[PDB]
Design a protein around this nucleic acid. Structure first.
Ligand SMILES: [K+]
Ligand SMILES: [Mg+2]
Ligand SMILES: [Mg+2]
Ligand SMILES: [Mg+2]
Ligand SMILES: [Mg+2]
Ligand SMILES: [Mg+2]
Ligand SMILES: [Mg+2]
Ligand SMILES: [Mg+2]
Ligand SMILES: [Mg+2]
Ligand SMILES: [Mg+2]
Ligand SMILES: [Mg+2]
Ligand SMILES: [Mg+2]
Ligand SMILES: [Mg+2]
Ligand SMILES: [Mg+2]
Ligand SMILES: [Mg+2]
Ligand SMILES: [Mg+2]
Ligand SMILES: [Mg+2]
Ligand SMILES: [Mg+2]
Ligand SMILES: [Mg+2]
Ligand SMILES: [Mg+2]
Ligand SMILES: [Mg+2]
Ligand SMILES: [Mg+2]
Lengths: 7, 88, 224, 129
RNA sequence: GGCGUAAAGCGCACGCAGGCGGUUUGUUAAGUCAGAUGUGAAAUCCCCGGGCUCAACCUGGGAACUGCAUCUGAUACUGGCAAGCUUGAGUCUCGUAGAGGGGGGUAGAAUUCCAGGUGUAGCGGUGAAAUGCGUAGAGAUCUGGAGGAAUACCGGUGGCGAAGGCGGCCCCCUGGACGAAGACUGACGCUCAGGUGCGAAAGCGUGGGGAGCAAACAGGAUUAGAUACCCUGGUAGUCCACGCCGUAAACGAUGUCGACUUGGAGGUUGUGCCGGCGUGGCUUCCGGAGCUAACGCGUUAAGUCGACCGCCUGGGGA
RNA sequence: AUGUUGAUAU
């Protein structure tokens, strides 16, 4: 998830 | 297996000589003796499947020798199956 | 060469039968005490025609190269080569001595440069340690490239003790189409070798016999 | 079981050549001997000889030239699983005539050269080259 | 053209049809081969020409139509028929090793439970715990008893079996393999679609049995959660009889049979000659040529060949 | 003991 990454 | 004595009796009965062990008639007669002997074993030992594979080899071998004898000499075949008491 | 010399020298003794190469079946007489006996009746004729062609190459002013790096057969090979005025490799064969001669040539020049430096008294100029390095650097180059320092190019034939042990030299000699003459014991493979000499490669007494003969025949070639 | 003795002879030669054997020994037969003649006459093998009465043994002596074996290839062509018969016009040239096809014609076993000359076709036994 | 690992060897066998078939002689002439004759419409294609200004196009003659049939010969090979032969295959004699199979019996070690003695506060369990067990006396220790299941050591890249598989000891019934000497039969063989049989474990049916173990399940943990791994329990099942199922990475991921082609080191089981020297069977590891995309395989081939069968044809969908 | 994950194209 997170509504779509790596930071 | 068939005993030394019982083997020798069949060799004399079916052989042209006492030393004629090879003949198709002797071979077929010996197989028939052991196939008939083992009927008692497999009546008792229905799940002796490993031994039965040996029985069905004898049955097969005998069929091949009778099919040989028949086409080689029809009369010798007809005499043999009568004595031993085989359908074919 | 004589056959009484061979059986005296112990040329007939091969390796244990378990260590044999099957391609040496033609040259093997039999087995005594689980050790292959080389047939000397094969050796002597084969060694004569080996000694014949070496003489022929010698007579054409050919550079013979005596390769044999086994501990026992080292100083034998150098004595035979120097007595004959020919070249040798009596310690570790450098991979690419012949096939990479263009490179190895440069390491000859170093051995030549260091010895000319040594005798001049160039080592006294540098500060002890620097000279002691050069002393050690000369020493290692003498061991490796000492026998072929004056060779000047590729040799005209190889003479080899132990075809298995010196398989790299032979494979290089095959690569460049240089004739290989070799002592081939029962454990060894004769296929690279151009003139097989079925014999005991191990014993010093056997080694001296072969080397003495090739030394003689090549020296006799250089005479005539 | 053994069901092609000719293929077996060709294979004994092929293998024997590869193994640098001097001679190869098979059980003999008339047809094997007939082939051995054609291989002798065309110069692929050196010699042969039958030995025995009850069980005859053919024994081909093999040729090597400059180290190499002389029989470069030797292929069964007609075989029990598929018989090949050719008419005179359609006889095979092995290696553009540099090798032979052994042909069983009505006038005995012979090369495809000899069969062309005799005007016969027949069963193509093998190629040799 | 492929099928050890890329897709591909049926799990294994027996075997009918079929395919294939050691060696010698004769015979036949079906296959096969040779020749001849008839036919193979014309056009088309092809070749050498001719005609339209050229070409396309048109057209003369040939060649071709690889085929089919008939007749007459050839007889090596294949087939048929007849008679052989012993080398393939099989029979007999004597012996050898074996967890080969089926049936019955029995032994010792251990677990669990039951009863009782001694004894007293823990036991058990884990990474750490807790659930659990225990003063109603556990755990530990000793005695006696019951019952089921499996057979330590021997034990071995040991053995046996078609494969699946088979392990205490004893007996009964029984299959195969191997070796040595001959003698005997005389190709009786190989392979095998369909067919038939056997086929681990799990599972199913009926009736037994049930110590230990353990899907499910329950509880305790762990964790963000933990429908898991760990812990405490625990039912089917695992065991027996009979029947069914018919599948497994049922594997050497390698079909069966036969022949041939350098070596080395073992294991196991016969045997001959006198600890050595041979010679058979089965088997483990390495490796040569050769083979292979390579890895590797390598006389137990994945090398060199023959016979027959099975199977593959991009990934997915399946 | 346990001990998850890393948007699309390039
Ligand atoms: K998520
Ligand atoms: Mg029997
Ligand atoms: Mg392909
Ligand atoms: Mg795969
Ligand atoms: Mg695959
Ligand atoms: Mg298989
Ligand atoms: Mg079968
Ligand atoms: Mg035949
Ligand atoms: Mg005909
Ligand atoms: Mg014109
Ligand atoms: Mg025309
Ligand atoms: Mg026409
Ligand atoms: Mg015939
Ligand atoms: Mg089937
Ligand atoms: Mg079960
Ligand atoms: Mg049940
Ligand atoms: Mg029940
Ligand atoms: Mg549990
Ligand atoms: Mg399957
Ligand atoms: Mg498989
Ligand atoms: Mg290997
Ligand atoms: Mg991740």
């Amino acid at each position: 998830x997170x509504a779509x990454x790596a930071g | 297996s068939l005993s030394t004595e019982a083997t020798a009796k069949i060799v004399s009965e079916f052989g042209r000589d006492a030393n004629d062990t090879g003949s198709t008639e002797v071979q077929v007669a010996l197989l028939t003796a052991q196939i008939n002997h083992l009927q008692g074993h497999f009546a008792e030992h229905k799940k002796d499947h490993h031994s039965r594979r040996g029985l069905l080899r004898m049955v097969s071998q005998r069929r091949k020798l009778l099919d040989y004898l028949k086409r080689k000499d029809v009369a010798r075949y007809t005499q043999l199956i009568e004595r031993l008491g085989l359908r074919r | 060469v004589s056959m009484r010399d061979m059986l005296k020298a112990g040329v007939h003794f091969g390796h244990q039968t378990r260590y044999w190469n099957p391609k040496m079946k033609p040259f093997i007489f039999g087995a005594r005490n689980k050790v292959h006996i080389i047939n000397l009746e094969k050796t002597v004729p084969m060694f004569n025609e080996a000694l014949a062609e070496l003489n022929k190459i010698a007579s054409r002013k050919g550079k013979i190269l005596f390769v044999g790096t086994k501990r026992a057969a080292s100083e034998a090979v150098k004595d035979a080569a120097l007595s004959c005025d020919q070249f040798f490799v009596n310690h570790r064969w450098l991979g690419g001595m012949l096939t990479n001669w263009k490179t190895v040539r440069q390491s000859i020049k170093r051995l030549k440069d260091l010895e000319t430096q040594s005798q001049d008294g160039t080592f006294d100029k540098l500060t002890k340690k620097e000279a002691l390095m050069r002393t050690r650097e000369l020493e290692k180059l003498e061991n490796s490239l000492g026998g072929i320092k004056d060779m000047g190019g590729l040799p005209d034939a190889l003479f080899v003790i132990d075809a298995d042990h010196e398989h790299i030299a032979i494979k290089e000699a095959n690569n460049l189409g240089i004739p290989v003459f070799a002592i081939v014991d029962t454990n060894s493979d004769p296929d690279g070798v151009d003139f097989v000499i079925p014999g005991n490669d191990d014993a010093i007494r056997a080694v001296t016999l072969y080397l003495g003969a090739v030394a003689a025949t090549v020296r006799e070639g250089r005479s005539q | 079981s053994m069901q092609d003795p000719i293929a077996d002879m060709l294979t004994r030669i092929r293998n024997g050549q590869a193994a640098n054997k001097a001679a190869v020994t098979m059980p003999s037969s008339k047809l094997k001997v007939a082939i051995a003649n054609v291989l002798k006459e065309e110069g692929f093998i050196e010699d042969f000889k039958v030995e025995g009465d009850t069980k005859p043994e053919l024994e081909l002596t093999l040729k090597y030239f400059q180290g190499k074996a002389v029989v470069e290839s030797i292929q069964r062509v007609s075989r029990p699983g598929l018989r090949i018969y050719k008419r005179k016009d359609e006889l095979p040239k092995v290696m553009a005539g540099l090798g032979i096809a052994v042909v069983s014609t009505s006038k005995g076993v012979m090369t495809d050269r000899a069969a062309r000359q005799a005007g016969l076709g027949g069963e193509i036994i093998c190629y040799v080259a």
